[PDB]
Paper text:
The pleiotropic functions of ghrelin are mediated through the ghrelin receptor, also known as the growth hormone secretagogue receptor, which was first identified in the pituitary gland and the hypothalamus. As a G protein-coupled receptor (GPCR), the ghrelin receptor couples to Gq protein and modulates diverse physiological processes upon binding to ghrelin and other synthetic agonists. One unique feature of ghrelin is its acylation, primarily with an octanoic acid, which is essential for its binding and activation of the ghrelin receptor, a G protein-coupled receptor. Here we present two cryo-electron microscopy structures of Gq-coupled ghrelin receptor bound to ghrelin and a synthetic agonist, GHRP-6.
The complex structures of the Gq-coupled ghrelin receptor bound to ghrelin and GHRP-6 were determined by cryo-EM to the resolutions of 2.9 Å and 3.2 Å, respectively. The N-terminus of ghrelin inserts deep in the helix bundle. The N-terminal amino acids from Gly1P to Pro7P of ghrelin occupied nearly the entire receptor TMD binding pocket. The peptide fragment from Glu8P to Arg15P is enriched with polar and charged amino acids and adopts an α-helical conformation, which sits above the orthosteric pocket and interacts with the solvent. A density connects the side-chain of Ser3P and stretches horizontally toward the gap between TM4 and TM5, occupying cavity II of the binding pocket. Five carbons of the eight-carbon fatty acid modification can be placed in the density. F2866.58 covers the side-chain of Ser3P, while the fatty acid chain of ghrelin forms hydrophobic contacts with I1784.60 and L1814.63. Gly1P and Ser2P locate in cavity I of the ghrelin receptor binding pocket. The main chain CO group of Ser2P forms an H-bond with the side-chain of R1022.63, which is critical for ghrelin binding. Meanwhile, the N-terminal amino acid Gly1P engages hydrophobic interactions with F2796.51 and F3127.42, which sit at the bottom of the binding pocket.
Numbering used by the authors:
A (entry chain N): 1 to 128
B (entry chain G): 6 to 62
C (entry chain B): 3 to 340
D (entry chain A): 15 to 62, 204 to 252, 264 to 394
E (entry chain C): 0 to 14
F (entry chain R): 35 to 241, 257 to 334
The structure:
């Protein structure tokens, strides 16, 4: 079965660094574009960053540009999100999302109504 | 409330799925193969039918 | 507690996976290694049906294997006499955004539905000598994806609201509802006895339902993307599924696990329609790459290709007698192959 | 016996011709927008449990069919496939400098969707009046959501409407550029985007769609009639 | 198509 | 050799055969590709299929003109054949020019009034326009059956001087209008239309479109280059029969020779200019 198990999270002081890792299984990882989505308390899901199949094309949302970097390891079906310079506004549960179909450019993974191809996410808290 | 209800429904439905009787995959493969072989001679697509009785030509 | 329930679900999933693994001794490929190959099959277009002004979505073969209905975005349902290409009825729809249609087994009623979230039942025979809406089955919260007649009084419809319902045409109220899915239901197929049906719901899973108990009997997983097409094996014990990951899979209810996967490295496009021949040896799959492929259901080898269509293939259907296969496409043309 | 079948088939053909004419002469549009977008008022501007709504209006003798998705689920990736034959897609985005990033993502997905690679998108930057007051208030922290705004200057050739302050012009032109960069990122040119600034209550909306459809049909004709 | 002149045309005018 | 000494004659016939091969290939390909492709079966493609048929049928008549240019020996073929291919060439020329004019008008309507084009031109109107064009071409070429004919000098055996040339009745009659002036229409009206409408199209598309404007310009230039010498040579030929004028005979002969090359050049280039720019035509080839 297609599943995405995220790892990491926890409590980190402001300005620190925290790495999120997701283990992908049940599908051919090297052919699907990957994405990161977070849901802040009392807020809708927000798209974070994207990475193509080969990693040659990457984009970030304005709030995290220059702070977060996304990488993938096709050799072990793992997706990475190295976070630096965390801020209180960054506290949210982070989900790993996948495109509905392979070899495709567009995506519709921000849907909140039970998107099948995403994990349960890991809570990230930024506080003193 | 909604999350716990959904979790309970999923758990009970999957539990009820877990107790169904199952047969070996070899038996299933043999059954499908036998069914396919028995009706092979009665499939126009598998074996072409002469135009004398083909309704499209 | 949420975490405890999730842990219990994970443990039960592991138990089910262990049962699947222990239930498998050999693959269908190993058993069928001694079966002679079907060989190359060549099929030629016998009829080219014209008269549609927009891309076609769904078509259903009649029980007599002569009359077939088609649905196009122009808002017209056309019943074609495949033997002579004549048009028997042209129904102007109240909503031009139709995506599915169904022809009743008795042939007295034809149904369709789409983005309007309403299933319209059209009566083809009446003393007035005209086609009129017999009943509209409103009540869905999403676009209808597939419609099939269990009987002249009962119709089962799928919707993109993660729900399927069994309607009563006489009263127009749902008799039972299926809510075990978590995504948009794309297609469902009725078993030969009409006692069971399966559907895929864009969650890479297929589920088996009972039309009386109103509950899922089995859940099938293994796909890597949305399932578009589902079709029962002629014997009613297995079914085939097509998904956007460019692979078809065969599932058996009694074995309750995947038997075969039909994948080719040259295919990088999804499957639109899946159908079985009368004997079940040939598996016909429609593709987004403008042509259809025929697969050996037992050997998983490609037996032939149908490339007549010049656009995406939307619907594929085989006559109940297996005499010919009609393939619809977004080129507004229906081609019958034999 | 069988001659009656041919007679009724010919009658059906004759009935199909006189609505084929209507189908060919008709222009179809899809109205896409977020929940906060003022697409509802735009529909009200047009004048002569359902999952889809239809609006009838005509400008200069040409009939337009505008379809708005009503009671529908947010799984757009499947039902959006139907609207691949519409002449143009009307996209309405609310200037909320932050729901604007979601609008950018949706526009990007529409542009790069395989079956929408041949449809021009009519982009309406709705609710300019709210944006003007927000930016004039000094609390419009656009730089926080889009850091590129801190290093962006208004184009020299930009034509601003009279009475608009430089800040409003710069902000709205940056908003246009955010969509134009995605539109031109493809570099293929099969379809074109038409960015416009409009308000919820404005009578010029009908003319904008008329001109955009005229341009789209002209571009299609260039290819159809061997000109390009 | 086109119409040509006879080589003798120069002297046929001489009757 | 009696006309156009051997070197020039060999050069012109080599050019004519090369143009025949190229134009036959192009016209056959254009006609066959459209006939079996619903994707390419549009109004402009129907007009171009008619034009390609006309050009193809023109080339099938090349040998009769080529032997006349080469030999001019006593006309062995029947008079009916002389009249037949003369009428055929004239009718095909008129049909091609009228098809070009109709295509230019359709392009003008489509590019200047894109939303009004679909309510003007369609299969029903296209078929009627083609039928009317062919009917008028045949009617205007009909007088050919009384202009041209086999004639012989009184002084010797007809079998030794038979010539496919205009009959003396037309020469002495006032039919000089039919041979030249009546054919002047279908040059002046088509050229004025192809100029004004294409200038308006270029103005609207200019106000990339550079390539299509340049292609329209070269199309107009090719039409002018190919058809102006043809008509001026025919006019010179007609006035050559007037008494007291013999100096213009050589000029008329050379103008007709160059028109011989240019006519087949235009016919062979017709399938090129109007189809190569259609990337749909390239892909669907
Ligand atoms: C004396 C005659 C034979 C000279 C040639 C006449 C024929 C070949 C010409 C004149 C009218 C022309 C037709 C006019 C209209 C059409 C419709 C088009 O969709 C198919 C070709 C077709 C049918 C044309 C083919 C060529 C045509 C048939
Ligand atoms: C020899 C002549 C007839 C060739 C005509 C070519 C036509 C189709 C094209 C080629 C170049 C084009 C011209 C290029 C420049 C301009 C500037 C524009 O603001 C007025 C029209 C005008 C003058 C164009 C008219 C259309 C045009 C003339
Ligand atoms: C030359 O031989 C034919 C010239 C044509 C003159 C008649 C014009 C219709």
């Amino acid at each position: 079965q297609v599943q995405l198990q995220e790892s990491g999270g926890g409590l980190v002081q402001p300005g620190g660094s925290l790495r999120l890792s997701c283990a992908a299984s049940g599908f051919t990882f090297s052919n699907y574009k990957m994405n990161w989505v977070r849901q802040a308390p009392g807020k809708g899901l927000e798209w974070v960053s994207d990475i193509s199949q080969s990693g040659a094309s990457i984009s970030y949302t304005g709030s995290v540009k220059g702070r977060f970097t996304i990488s993938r390891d096709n050799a072990k079906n793992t997706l990475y999100l190295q976070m630096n310079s965390l801020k209180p506004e960054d506290t949210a549960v982070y989900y790993c999302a996948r495109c509905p179909a392979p070899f495709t450019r567009d995506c519709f993974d921000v849907t909140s109504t039970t998107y099948a191809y995403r994990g349960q996410g890991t809570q990230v808290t930024v506080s003193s | 409330t909604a999350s716990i209800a959904q979790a309970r429904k999923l758990v009970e439905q999957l539990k009820m799925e877990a107790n169904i009787d199952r047969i070996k995959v070899s038996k299933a493969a043999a059954d499908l193969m036998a069914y396919c072989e028995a009706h092979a001679k009665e499939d126009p697509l598998l074996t072409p039918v002469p135009a004398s009785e083909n309704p499209f030509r | 507690e949420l975490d405890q329930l999730r842990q219990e679900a994970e443990q039960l999933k592991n138990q089910i996976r262990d049962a699947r693994k222990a239930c498998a001794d050999a693959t269908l490929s190993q058993i069928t290694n001694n079966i002679d190959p079907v060989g190359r099959i060549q099929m030629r277009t016998r009829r080219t049906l014209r008269g549609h002004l927009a891309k076609i979505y769904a078509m259903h073969w009649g029980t007599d294997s002569r009359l077939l209905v088609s649905a196009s975005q122009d808002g017209k349902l056309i019943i074609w006499d495949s033997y002579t290409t004549n048009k028997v009825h042209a129904i102007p729809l109240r909503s031009s955004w139709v995506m599915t249609c169904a022809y009743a087994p008795s042939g007295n009623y034809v149904a369709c539905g789409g983005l309007d979230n309403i299933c319209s039942i059209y009566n083809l025979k009446t003393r007035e000598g005209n086609v009129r809406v017999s009943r509209e089955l409103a009540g869905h919260t999403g676009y209808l994806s597939c419609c099939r007649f269990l009987d002249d009084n009962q119709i089962v419809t799928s919707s993109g609201d993660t729900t399927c319902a069994l309607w009563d045409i006489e009263t127009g109220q749902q008799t039972t509802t299926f809510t075990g899915h978590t995504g948009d239901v794309m297609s469902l197929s009725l078993a030969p006895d009409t006692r069971l049906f399966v559907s895929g719901a864009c969650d890479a899973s297929a589920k088996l339902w009972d039309v009386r108990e109103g509950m899922c009997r089995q859940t099938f997983t293994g796909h890597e993307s949305d399932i578009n097409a589902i079709c029962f094996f002629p014997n009613g014990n297995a079914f085939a599924t097509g998904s956007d990951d460019a692979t078809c899979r065969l599932f058996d209810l009694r074995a309750d696990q995947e038997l075969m996967t039909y994948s080719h490295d040259n295919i990088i496009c999804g499957i639109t329609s899946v159908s079985f021949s009368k004997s079940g040896r040939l598996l016909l799959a429609g593709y987004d790459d403008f042509n259809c492929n025929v697969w050996d259901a037992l050997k998983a080898d490609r037996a032939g290709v149908l490339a007549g269509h010049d656009n995406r293939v939307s619907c594929l259907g085989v006559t109940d007698d297996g005499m010919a296969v009609a393939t619809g496409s977004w080129d507004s043309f229906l081609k019958i192959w034999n | 016996e069988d001659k009656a079948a041919v007679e009724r088939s010919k009658m059906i053909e004759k009935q199909l011709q006189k609505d084929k004419q209507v189908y060919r002469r008709t222009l179809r549009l899809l109205l896409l927008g977020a929940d906060n977008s003022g697409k509802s008022t735009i529909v009200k501007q047009m004048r002569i449990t359902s999952g889809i709504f239809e609006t009838k209006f005509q400008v200069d003798k040409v009939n337009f069919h505008m379809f708005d998705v009503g009671a529908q689920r947010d799984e757009r990736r499947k039902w959006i496939q139907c609207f691949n034959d519409v002449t143009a897609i009307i996209f309405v985005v609310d200037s909320s400098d932050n729901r604007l990033q979601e609008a950018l993502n949706d526009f990007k997905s529409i542009w790069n969707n395989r079956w929408l690679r041949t449809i021009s998108v009519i982009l309406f930057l709705n609710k300019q009046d709210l944006l003007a007051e927000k930016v004039l208030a000094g609390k419009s922290k656009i730089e926080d959501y889009f850091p590129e705004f801190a290093r962006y200057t208004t184009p020299e050739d930009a034509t601003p409407e009279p009475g608009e302050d430089p800040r409003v012009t710069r902000a709205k032109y940056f908003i246009r550029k955010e969509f134009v960069d995605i539109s031109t990122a493809s570099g293929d040119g099969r379809h074109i985007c038409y960015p416009h600034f409009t308000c919820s209550v404005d009578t010029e909306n009908a003319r904008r769609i008329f001109n955009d459809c005229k341009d789209i049909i002209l571009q299609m004709n260039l290819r159809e009639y061997n000109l390009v | 198509g086109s119409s040509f002149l006879s080589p003798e045309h120069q002297r046929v005018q001489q009757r | 050799l009696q006309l156009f000494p051997a070197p020039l004659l060999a050069g012109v016939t080599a050019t004519c055969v090369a143009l025949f091969v190229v134009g036959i290939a192009g016209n056959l390909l254009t006609m066959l590709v459209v006939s079996r492709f619903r994707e390419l079966r549009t109004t402009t493609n129907l007009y171009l299929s008619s034009m390609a048929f006309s050009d193809l049928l023109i080339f099938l008549c090349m040998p009769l003109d080529l032997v006349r240019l080469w030999q001019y020996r006593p006309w062995n073929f029947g008079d009916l054949l002389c009249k037949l291919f003369q009428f055929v060439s004239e009718s095909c020329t008129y049909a091609t020019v009228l098809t070009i004019t109709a295509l230019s008008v359709e392009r003008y309507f489509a590019i200047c009034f894109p939303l009004r084009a679909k309510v003007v031109v369609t299969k029903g109107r296209v078929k009627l326009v083609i039928f009317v064009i062919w009917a008028v071409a045949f009617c205007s070429a009909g007088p050919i059956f009384v202009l041209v004919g086999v004639e012989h000098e009184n002084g010797t055996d007809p079998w030794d001087t038979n010539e496919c040339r205009p009959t003396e009745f037309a020469v002495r009659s006032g039919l000089l209008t039919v041979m030249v002036w009546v054919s002047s229409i279908f040059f002046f009206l088509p050229v004025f239309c192809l100029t004004v409408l294409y200038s308006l199209i270029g103005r609207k598309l200019w106000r990339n479109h550079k390539q299509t404007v340049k292609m329209l310009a070269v199309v107009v230039f090719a039409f002018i280059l190919c058809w102006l010498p043809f008509h001026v040579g025919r006019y010179l030929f007609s006035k050559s029969f007037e008494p007291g004028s013999l100096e213009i005979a050589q000029i008329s002969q050379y103008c007709n020779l160059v028109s011989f090359v240019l006519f087949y050049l235009s016919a062979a280039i017709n399938p090129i200019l109007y189809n190569i720019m259609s990337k749909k035509y390239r892909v669907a080839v």
